[PDB]
Enzyme design. Structure first.
Site, PDB file in Angstrom:
ATOM      1  N   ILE A 144      -1.372   0.122   6.633  1.00 42.77           N
ATOM      2  CA  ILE A 144      -0.142  -0.678   6.670  1.00 42.77           C
ATOM      3  C   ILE A 144      -0.374  -2.090   6.116  1.00 42.77           C
ATOM      4  CG2 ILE A 144       1.158   0.549   8.457  1.00 42.77           C
ATOM      5  CD1 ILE A 144      -0.065  -1.423  10.498  1.00 42.77           C
ATOM      6  N   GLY A 176      -4.229  -9.187  -2.109  1.00 43.56           N
ATOM      7  CA  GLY A 176      -5.436  -9.929  -2.449  1.00 43.56           C
ATOM      8  C   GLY A 176      -6.640  -9.017  -2.581  1.00 43.56           C
ATOM      9  N   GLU A 216      -6.844  -4.496   2.606  1.00 40.24           N
ATOM     10  CA  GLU A 216      -5.697  -3.797   3.166  1.00 40.24           C
ATOM     11  C   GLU A 216      -5.776  -3.889   4.683  1.00 40.24           C
ATOM     12  OE1 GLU A 216      -9.134  -1.203   2.050  1.00 40.24           O
ATOM     13  OE2 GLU A 216      -7.681  -2.261   0.790  1.00 40.24           O
ATOM     14  N   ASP A 272       0.573 -22.295   7.192  1.00 41.56           N
ATOM     15  CA  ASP A 272       1.321 -21.212   6.596  1.00 41.56           C
ATOM     16  C   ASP A 272       2.505 -20.805   7.475  1.00 41.56           C
ATOM     17  OD1 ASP A 272       1.840 -19.207   4.718  1.00 41.56           O
ATOM     18  OD2 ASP A 272      -0.196 -18.383   4.810  1.00 41.56           O
TER      19      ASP A 272
END
Ligand SMILES: [Mg+2]
Length: 586
Positions: free
Chosen positions: A168, A172, A175, A288
């Site tokens: 899921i 970059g 995973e 972020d």
RNA sequence: CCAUAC
């Protein structure tokens, strides 16, 4: 799969390990989960004179976290009566008078705070650390403790140690798989960055970094961060083991629900702030902050996701223009200009604003030809305004005390923050039921992946505790009990250092290190052969065949090889052997 | 041309 435990003989080698590391203290032993558990497995079953102290203590802790004021009003009586009052006029007490006067003083006025018996908690520990701690140290239930910790330090992980299920995530380098740890059967989200892809983009920095950031954030029991548990690397894969999160993300749930209510949203805000707080304590900035970076669980409580774009500022403030473009602060966006927590506080406002709206705060286009809409309580306004001041010292969580300034806001005029930390508050939304061939692994570059892997003592002990531990104690208790009566030391009396298990040119042997000699023997014998310290010269560790082992050079001339069962063993063997002959030769 | 448990 089941984690088999080592032998009771381990005790000597391990206690020698731990003592040098000063972990033979009540403090560290108690502060550890499995050490605590074995302490209560100990005294409540076995030693009689200490039983009540823990019962009382346990009951205090059970008490502390009662939700409503009246449930404490009831329980306060229970305890004083049973543990204090019953053993008061019966004399069973080395406690103080004042202890009770302060206790009774508050008791008298019908006032029941949670941090009430904390005085007793403290004075309890003094009575345990003294005589009782010594008696604990010498036990089956300490002998047990060392066997577990031995596992802790000999937990090195592979792909077999995980039973991977699903995928899921893609982005970059790595995973996001889902998996189950074979050892126990624990559910972890696995994030596997690929070394080759890490090498192409020169993002080795960010992969190594992320571990550090993971590794600093994850200690201290925090519920609002997706915390690592182990790191481990293969020949070509970097793995982080992280807390699994099922209820999608907030971006997805923002869609289905549409805009959020204020009182609803308030819940998330808080959750986050406490998470944020934990980072600013350890000098980390997420930068972020965003709905997507905030995930949920099956219950409805949140965590913060991809530490990736995070940075340590304790020792050097960063000046990079990093973050999701929608929530980057004034300070971040500048050449050669630095920032800190501020950024997180800014992003938060934008983020919260977006939860109740969806509209966009900042974008560069203005001049000629934040102002807020008319669907806000002034309490809500007051908050965002202060969080989203365009200037550094002007905004919240900055000029003073950090996350505390945020907490004090009148939008949280009706909100207890210790209760939030326990997650007693009702969730607003429960979830629904759901290339690179031309690269070569240079073993020269692998050398900056040494000590990438890290088992986290806190999270492993917890993991273990909350599943196997108790059932696996009965396992070896059986094994140990069923082997003692099968059979039926050479150590005490004379002057011994250590004893344990190893091998040679492979034959398993029980060894016994003295200050002057080293004996060994088969398990139905007396001391077979020996080896003096006056004749050993060089003690190195030639870790051949991908197996840590020991090289001994003798005055005779012949080399001598010893392989150890766990690493902790080898390390403590290496050390005390060197210590033996260097003084023995003098 | 970055992000990606978005
Ligand atoms: Mg990332």
């Amino acid at each position: 799969k089941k984690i088999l435990l080592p032998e009771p003989s381990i005790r000597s080698v391990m206690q020698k390990y731990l003592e040098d590391r000063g972990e033979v203290t009540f403090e560290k032993i108690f502060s550890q989960k499995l050490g605590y558990l074995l302490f209560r497995d100990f005294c409540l079953k076995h030693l009689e004179e200490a039983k009540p102290l823990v019962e009382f203590y346990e009951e205090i802790k059970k008490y502390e976290k009662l939700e409503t004021e009246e449930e404490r009003l009831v329980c306060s009586r229970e305890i004083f009566d049973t543990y204090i009052m019953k053993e008061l006029l019966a004399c069973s007490h080395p406690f103080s008078k004042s202890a009770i006067e302060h206790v009774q003083g508050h008791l008298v006025k019908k006032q029941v705070p949670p941090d009430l018996f904390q005085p007793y908690i403290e004075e309890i520990c003094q009575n345990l650390r003294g005589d009782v701690f010594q008696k604990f140290i010498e036990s089956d239930k300490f002998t047990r403790f060392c066997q577990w910790k031995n596992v802790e330090l000999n937990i090195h992980l592979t792909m077999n140690d995980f039973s991977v299920h699903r995928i899921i995530g893609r982005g970059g380098f790595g995973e996001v798989y889902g998996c189950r740890k074979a050892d126990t059967g624990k559910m972890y989200a696995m994030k596997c960055l690929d070394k080759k892809r890490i090498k192409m983009k020169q993002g080795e920095t960010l992969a190594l970094n992320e571990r550090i950031m993971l590794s600093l954030v994850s200690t201290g029991d925090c519920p609002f961060i997706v915390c690592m548990s182990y790191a481990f690397h293969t020949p070509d894969k970097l793995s982080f083991i992280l807390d699994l999160m099922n209820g999608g993300d907030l971006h997805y749930h923002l869609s289905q629900h549409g805009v959020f209510s204020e009182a609803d949203m308030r819940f998330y805000a808080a959750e986050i702030i406490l998470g944020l707080e934990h980072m600013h304590n350890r000098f980390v900035v997420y930068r972020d902050l965003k709905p997507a970076n905030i995930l949920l669980d099956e219950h409805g409580h949140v965590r913060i996701s991809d530490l990736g774009l995070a940075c340590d500022f304790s020792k050097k403030k960063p000046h990079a223009s990093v973050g999701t473009h929608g929530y980057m602060a004034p300070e971040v966006l500048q050449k050669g200009v630095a920032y800190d927590s501020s950024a997180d506080w800014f992003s938060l406002g934008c983020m919260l604003f977006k939860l109740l709206r969806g509209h966009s705060p900042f974008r560069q286009h203005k001049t000629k030809d934040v102002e807020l809409p008319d669907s806000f309580s002034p309490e809500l306004r007051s908050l965002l305004e202060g969080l989203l001041q365009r200037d550094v010292n002007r905004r919240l969580g900055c000029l003073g005390r950090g996350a505390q300034e945020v907490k004090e806001s009148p939008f949280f005029r009706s909100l207890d923050w210790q209760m939030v930390f326990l997650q007693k508050y009702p969730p607003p939304l429960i979830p629904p039921r759901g290339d690179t061939k031309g690269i070569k692994l240079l073993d020269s570059d692998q050398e900056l992946y040494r000590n990438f892997p890290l088992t986290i003592s806190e999270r492993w002990q917890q993991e273990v505790a909350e599943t196997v531990f108790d059932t696996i104690n009965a396992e070896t208790d059986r094994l140990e009990a069923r082997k003692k009566t099968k059979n039926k030391d050479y150590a005490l009396g004379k002057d011994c250092i250590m004893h344990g298990y190893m091998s040679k040119m492979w034959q398993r042997r029980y060894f016994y290190l003295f200050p002057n000699r080293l004996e060994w023997r088969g398990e139905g014998e007396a001391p077979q052969s020996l080896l003096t310290m006056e004749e050993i010269q060089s003690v190195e560790e030639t870790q051949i065949k991908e197996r840590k082992c020991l090289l001994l050079k003798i005055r005779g001339g012949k080399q001598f090889v010893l392989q150890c069962d766990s690493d902790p063993e080898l390390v403590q063997w290496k050390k005390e052997l060197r210590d033996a002959y260097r003084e023995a030769q003098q």
